[PDB]
Write an enzyme that holds these catalytic residues in place. Structure first.
Site, PDB file in Angstrom:
ATOM      1  N   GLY A   1      -4.423 -46.246 -45.944  1.00 53.14           N
ATOM      2  CA  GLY A   1      -3.137 -46.898 -45.935  1.00 53.14           C
ATOM      3  C   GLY A   1      -2.701 -47.037 -44.497  1.00 53.14           C
TER       4      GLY A   1
ATOM      5  N   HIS B   1     -12.248 -53.923 -43.199  1.00 55.76           N
ATOM      6  CA  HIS B   1     -12.360 -53.330 -44.544  1.00 55.76           C
ATOM      7  C   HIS B   1     -11.093 -53.392 -45.412  1.00 55.76           C
ATOM      8  CE1 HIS B   1     -10.429 -49.803 -42.858  1.00 55.76           C
ATOM      9  NE2 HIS B   1     -10.111 -49.508 -44.107  1.00 55.76           N
TER      10      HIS B   1
ATOM     11  N   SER C   1      -5.201 -47.959 -41.900  1.00 56.94           N
ATOM     12  CA  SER C   1      -6.144 -48.922 -41.339  1.00 56.94           C
ATOM     13  C   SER C   1      -5.662 -50.055 -40.504  1.00 56.94           C
ATOM     14  CB  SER C   1      -7.056 -49.454 -42.395  1.00 56.94           C
ATOM     15  OG  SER C   1      -8.029 -48.494 -42.666  1.00 56.94           O
ATOM     16  N   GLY C   2      -6.507 -50.480 -39.572  1.00 58.13           N
ATOM     17  CA  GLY C   2      -6.140 -51.568 -38.690  1.00 58.13           C
ATOM     18  C   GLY C   2      -4.929 -51.288 -37.872  1.00 58.13           C
TER      19      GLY C   2
ATOM     20  N   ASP D   1     -15.866 -53.081 -38.142  1.00 56.94           N
ATOM     21  CA  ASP D   1     -14.571 -53.037 -38.763  1.00 56.94           C
ATOM     22  C   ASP D   1     -13.344 -53.638 -38.059  1.00 56.94           C
ATOM     23  OD1 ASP D   1     -12.417 -51.750 -40.450  1.00 56.94           O
ATOM     24  OD2 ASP D   1     -14.226 -50.893 -41.310  1.00 56.94           O
TER      25      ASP D   1
END
Ligand SMILES: NC(=[NH2+])NCCC[C@H](NC(=O)CNC(=O)[C@@H](N)CCC(=O)O)[C@H](O)CCl
Ligand SMILES: *[C@@H]1O[C@H](CO)[C@@H](O)[C@H](O)[C@H]1O
Ligand SMILES: *C1O[C@@H](C)[C@@H](O)[C@@H](O)[C@@H]1O
Ligand SMILES: [Ca+2]
Ligand SMILES: [Ca+2]
Ligand SMILES: [Ca+2]
Ligand SMILES: [Ca+2]
Ligand SMILES: [Ca+2]
Ligand SMILES: [Ca+2]
Ligand SMILES: [Cl-]
Ligand SMILES: [Cl-]
Ligand SMILES: [Cl-]
Ligand SMILES: [Mg+2]
Ligand SMILES: [Mg+2]
Ligand code: NA
Ligand SMILES: [Zn+2]
Ligand SMILES: [Zn+2]
Lengths: 191, 142, 254
Positions: free
Chosen positions: C190, C41, C192-193, C90
C-alpha cells in the site's frame, strides 16, 4: 579484481592508518569510513598503496566508533567489490606511545622525575593536544626505578637515599582498559 | 670494548654508553640484572627512526620503538604528510564542494552546476532558486 | 508504513496518492507538474486504464481540504523488461492529463543525474520513505500520511544480514535495500511507488521507489527498493516523448 582482505587498524596516539592486503594488480582502491549511523566519507582515492590514513576523521570525536571499507576497482576507472573492517573506537583502542623522561631534579631527600608531555594528533585550536588533555582522569604515568611509583600528572616525587644515585623508566597507562592498557617503556635515564 | 689507557677507570655509562657505543655486556655489567639491562637495551639499541626525516611538507617526526609518528601541518595528511588536501578537490571527495552538481575537469578545476530551478551563486559552488516553487524544497517549513 | 510517524501537513509534498476507480491503489512521486514516478507492480491488475486518478495534496484520507488536487492519468510508461508477477524493473512514469498547480502543499522532488546519485546520494545514510500503506503486516492502512527514516545499505551487506529464504528473488543492480532487520520499522504494502527521498545540502532528491520486500518489518530482512539512478536517461528521454495512443505504453529499456 579481488576483495581486499586482512584489514588491521594501526593506531598510536590517535594517528590511525588502516591497512589491508594485497598489493594491487590492475586495481586501485578508495577508502570509506563512517560513524555507524552517519554518512560515508571518501578517502584515499584510487590508491595503489595498500594503506590509508584515517587520522583526520577519527580525531573529530575520538569516542565515536568508526567502520571502514576498502573498495576494489579495475584499471580504467552495479556496485564495487569491497571488504569491511572492524568497528574501531579510538579512545579505547589507540596505543599510548613511548614516554620520555624529560628531566629529574634531586630536591634534597626526594627526587622529582618529570615526564615529557605526549602529544596526540588531535590538532585542537592550532597546537596538538597531549594525552592528558584527551584522557585526563583516565591517564596515569607509572615509574619503575632502581621500585615502582604512580602519578595522575607528569611528575613523580620519590623518596630516595642520600648519595646512592638511581635509575629510571616510565610507562603510559590507562588503567580502565582490559587490553592495550600500557605503552612501551621509556629509554632509561640514571642520576 | 678495548681502548688501552682508557680502560683503567671502572664502569661508568655516561662514559661507556652515553659518550661512546655501549656493547650488550658492557650494559649487563653496569646493570647486573639482565632485566634492568632490558629496560635500557630495549631502547638503546633501537635507533632514532626519524633519522631519515620521513615527514614531508613541514611535518614533525616523533620517535618510538621501531617506528615514528609524523605530525602534519594543516593542509597535509598521511603517514609522512605526503598528501596535500588542496590537490584533492575532485567529485569523489564530498561532491567537490559543490552544493548540487559536480563535474571534473581533471587537469583544471572541477565545476559546480545546478538543477533545473536553481542558479549558481557568486561563489561558483552554491545554488539559488529562479522559479517560485523549486523541486526538493518544503515551503511550509520556511 | 510500519513503525513510522505522521508527516505533518505540508512536509512530504511530492506525495501522490494513486487511485483506480475511487479506490486506494498505490503511491508515487511528483517529479514536475505533469509527470509522476511510481511502481510498475501496482498496475499488474488494472483493467480500467481510463479510470486512474492521481491526487496531490492529500494528507488525511478521511477528510477534504482545499489543498487537494485530483488529476487524471493520461499515460503510464513502464519498461518492457518488466514481467508482471515479478519484482525486477519495478518503475513506472505517468503523464497527467492536466498539470498540477504548485503551491505550498504541492511541490516536486528532484530527479538527479546518474553520477551525482551514484557517487554522492548513494552514500548518505538515512533517507525518508512515505505512504498510506499497511501499518503492520497483514493489517489496517493509514488515514494520514506516515513517514519513516531508513538507512541505506550496499548489496553485499544486505545479502549477508538477510536471513535465508530459498523462494526469494535476487537483489539486482536495479534495486537496493534499506532498513531495520530487527523487525522494528519497514515500508509495507500500500506504499509502493512511494518516494524514498534523500536530503543533501538543502535539497531533496529521488533515489528510490518502494519496490518489494519479504513481509513488513520482518526480522532478518530489509525493504528492497528501486535504483532510480539506473533509469535517469530513460525517464528523461520519455518525458520528451510526444504522447502515444492508449493509456499503457510499454517503453523499451535499455
Ligand atoms: N517494504 C516491504 N517489506 N514491502 C513493500 C511491499 C510493497 C507492495 N508490493 C508488493 O507486495 C510486492 N511484493 C512484496 O513485497 C510481497 N513480499 C508482499 C506479500 C507479503 O510479504 O506480505 C505494494 O506497495 C502494493
Ligand atoms: C627513515 O628512512 C628509511 C630509508 O631512508 C625508511 O625506510 C624509514 O621508513 C624512515 O622512517
Ligand atoms: C612540527 O609540528 C608541526 C605541527 C609544526 O609546528 C611544524 O612547524 C613543526 O616542525
Ligand atoms: Ca676514549
Ligand atoms: Ca671504553
Ligand atoms: Ca666485559
Ligand atoms: Ca662493565
Ligand atoms: Ca627509535
Ligand atoms: Ca483528504
Ligand atoms: Cl602527557
Ligand atoms: Cl486533469
Ligand atoms: Cl510485503
Ligand atoms: Mg659524559
Ligand atoms: Mg665498557
Ligand atoms: Na525488517
Ligand atoms: Zn495537505
Ligand atoms: Zn480527492
Amino acid at each position: 579484481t579481488v576483495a581486499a582482505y586482512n584489514l588491521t587498524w594501526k593506531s598510536t596516539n590517535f594517528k590511525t592508518i588502516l591497512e589491508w592486503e594485497p598489493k594491487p594488480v590492475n586495481q586501485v582502491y578508495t577508502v570509506q569510513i563512517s560513524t555507524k549511523s552517519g554518512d560515508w566519507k571518501s578517502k584515499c582515492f584510487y590508491t595503489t598503496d595498500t594503506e590509508c590514513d584515517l587520522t583526520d576523521e577519527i580525531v573529530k570525536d575520538v569516542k565515536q566508533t568508526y567502520l571502514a571499507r576498502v573498495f576494489s576497482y579495475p584499471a580504467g576507472n552495479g556496485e564495487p567489490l569491497y571488504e569491511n573492517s572492524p568497528e574501531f573506537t579510538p579512545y579505547l583502542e589507540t596505543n599510548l606511545g613511548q614516554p620520555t623522561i624529560q628531566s629529574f631534579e634531586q630536591v634534597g631527600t626526594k627526587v622529582n622525575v618529570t615526564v615529557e608531555d605526549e602529544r596526540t594528533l588531535v590538532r585542537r585550536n592550532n597546537t596538538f593536544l597531549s594525552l592528558r588533555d584527551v584522557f585526563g582522569k583516565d591517564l596515569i604515568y607509572t615509574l619503575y626505578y632502581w621500585k615502582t611509583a604512580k602519578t595522575n600528572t607528569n611528575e613523580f616525587l620519590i623518596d630516595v637515599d642520600k648519595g646512592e644515585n638511581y635509575c629510571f623508566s616510565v610507562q603510559a597507562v590507562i588503567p580502565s582498559r582490559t587490553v592495550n592498557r600500557k605503552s612501551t617503556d621509556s629509554p632509561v635515564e640514571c642520576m | 670494548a678495548n681502548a688501552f689507557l682508557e680502560e683503567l677507570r671502572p664502569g661508568s655509562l655516561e662514559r661507556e654508553c652515553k659518550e661512546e657505543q655501549c656493547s650488550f655486556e658492557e650494559a649487563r655489567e653496569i646493570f647486573k640484572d639482565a632485566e634492568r639491562t632490558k629496560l635500557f637495551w630495549i631502547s638503546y639499541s633501537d635507533g632514532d627512526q626519524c633519522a631519515s626525516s620521513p615527514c614531508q611538507n613541514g611535518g614533525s617526526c616523533k620517535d618510538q620503538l621501531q617506528s615514528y609518528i609524523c605530525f602534519c601541518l594543516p593542509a597535509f595528511e598521511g603517514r609522512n604528510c605526503e598528501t596535500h588536501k588542496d590537490d584533492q578537490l575532485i567529485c569523489v571527495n564530498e561532491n567537490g564542494g559543490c552544493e548540487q552538481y559536480c563535474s571534473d575537469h581533471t587537469g583544471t578545476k572541477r565545476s559546480c552546476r545546478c538543477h533545473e530551478g536553481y542558479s549558481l551563486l557568486a561563489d561558483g559552488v552554491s545554488c539559488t532558486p529562479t522559479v517560485e516553487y523549486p523541486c526538493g524544497k518544503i515551503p511550509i517549513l520556511e | 508504513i510500519v513503525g513510522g510517524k505522521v508527516c505533518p501537513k505540508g512536509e512530504c509534498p511530492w506525495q501522490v496518492l494513486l487511485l483506480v476507480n475511487g479506490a486506494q491503489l498505490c503511491g508515487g512521486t511528483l517529479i514536475n507538474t505533469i509527470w509522476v514516478v511510481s511502481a510498475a507492480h501496482c498496475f499488474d491488475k488494472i483493467k480500467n486504464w481510463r479510470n486512474l486518478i492521481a491526487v496531490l495534496g492529500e494528507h488525511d484520507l478521511s477528510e477534504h481540504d482545499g489543498d487537494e488536487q485530483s488529476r487524471r492519468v493520461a499515460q503510464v510508461i513502464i519498461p518492457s523488461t518488466y514481467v508482471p508477477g515479478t519484482t525486477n524493473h519495478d518503475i513506472a512514469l505517468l503523464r497527467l492529463h492536466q498539470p498540477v498547480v504548485l503551491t505550498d502543499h504541492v511541490v516536486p522532488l528532484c530527479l538527479p543525474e546518474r553520477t551525482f546519485s551514484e557517487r554522492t546520494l548513494a552514500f548518505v545514510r538515512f533517507s525518508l520513505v512515505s505512504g498510506w500503506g499497511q501499518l503492520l503486516d497483514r493489517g489496517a492502512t493509514a488515514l494520514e500520511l506516515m513517514v519513516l527514516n531508513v538507512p541505506r545499505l550496499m548489496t553485499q551487506d544486505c545479502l549477508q544480514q538477510s536471513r535465508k529464504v530459498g523462494d526469494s528473488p535476487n537483489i539486482t543492480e536495479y534495486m537496493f535495500c534499506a532498513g531495520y532487520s530487527d523487525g522494528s520499522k519497514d515500508s509495507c504494502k500500500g506504499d509502493s511507488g512511494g518516494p524514498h527521498a534523500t536530503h543533501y545540502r538543502g535539497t531533496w532528491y529521488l533515489t528510490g521507489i518502494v519496490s518489494w520486500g519479504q513481509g513488513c518489518a520482518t526480522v532478518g530482512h530489509f525493504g528492497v527498493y528501486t535504483r532510480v539512478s539506473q533509469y535517469i536517461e530513460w525517464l528523461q528521454k520519455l518525458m520528451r516523448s510526444e504522447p502515444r495512443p492508449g493509456v499503457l505504453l510499454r517503453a523499451p529499456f535499455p
